[PDB]
Amino acid sequence: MREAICIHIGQAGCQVGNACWELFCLEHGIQPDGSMPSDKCIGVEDDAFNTFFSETGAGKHVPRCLFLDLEPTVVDEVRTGTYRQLFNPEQLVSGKEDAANNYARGHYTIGKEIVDLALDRIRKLADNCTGLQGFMVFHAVGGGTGSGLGALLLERLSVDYGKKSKLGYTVYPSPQVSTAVVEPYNCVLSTHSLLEHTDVATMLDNEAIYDLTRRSLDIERPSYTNVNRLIGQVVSSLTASLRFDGALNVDLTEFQTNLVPYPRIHFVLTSYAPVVSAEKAYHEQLSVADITNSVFEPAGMLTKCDPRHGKYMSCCLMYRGDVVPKDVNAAIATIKTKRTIQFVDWCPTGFKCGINYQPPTVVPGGDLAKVQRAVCMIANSTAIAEVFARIDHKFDLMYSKRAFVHWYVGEGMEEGEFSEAREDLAALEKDYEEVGAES
């Protein structure tokens, strides 16, 4: 068992899923056609692909994934792409008219009429499933379908699956770079769903990914392809503990306990190292201590947040490859002893460690340089309220003149919704800073 159901919503979520699945196929040996080499004896057979792929009578290895987009463009291009015979013709839902970066339209008018069969497909996946570890959602709250429709799906999943774990990777608007102008509206309106119907939320804004790619990964023209590849790498690193063997195997509900101290407190930071190119890959020493230091560098997170502008609460480190407990303990000790990184006074340990024997894989033409050892970070820290501060300031600038609100009003949303989301986000940031407040 130990399988999780992946859900991808919006152009951004669909491309995240495309990168994740092209990584997982190479991770487990499934070819783009959907077939992987198999044994003859029934006793000896690995099921490391069970977490992501479900076997079929015809030998196919269908991913345990759903794609959902109101705009048919991305899903149709996937249907015409390389993995056409990999991805199921169903569970690849297509709409007819997009949300047009409108949370109200994606949550009340157009999201309503497609979420109905979205739950049908998700529950079909769950019925095929037998050991569900959780739901594995990828989207961007910047737009309409990613925010409104993703939200709607989140509360329907919560109401029809009880306390099943949900891991939501959301591409928040960056502090200073964003595609849309109503993007702050969409993000703020989605904050409620990300707060109430998301057990753990991960921040994946594009600003930090672009800067990390330019600085360490050393690319002139970072693109959505590269950022989705990085997101796929971080997702694979997080799930590799239950995917493969390791000295300290950790499961989804296993590290949720060590990551989330309070139910309202679950929006966590993420980082990956060594995220380096071939240029520095054979010039800088990549030991366990060095990769841990690079992880805890406050310029290396996939989210552009400064841990020094807050204080850590719980760091979960997914070590993979050459890693050994005797070195990860020393890395934890040196992280503790250096004072540029602080923890809350009420969490003395503050560290969860999971060691996996599988070194991370790469992709053809991979921007990541292949390394024998790596480590991922999932950190709950009080500094995450700062990106919420940025986004609500954008929202306040937008909403002072009540601009771009007529679309939401005409798509069936009350104006008071903006207010409700505003005090909800304010309460969230207050709760964060109060968690970080000294006793």
């Binding site: 109101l70 297509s94 709409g95 007819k96 008219e97 157009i110 009429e113 497609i114 109905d116 069969l117």
Partner: peptide, 20 residues
Amino acid sequence: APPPTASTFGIHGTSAVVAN
């Protein structure tokens, strides 16, 4: 009497692939 469920008729011209 509720409308028919999972109906493919009446969706033409509307942004719905299924009807209710």
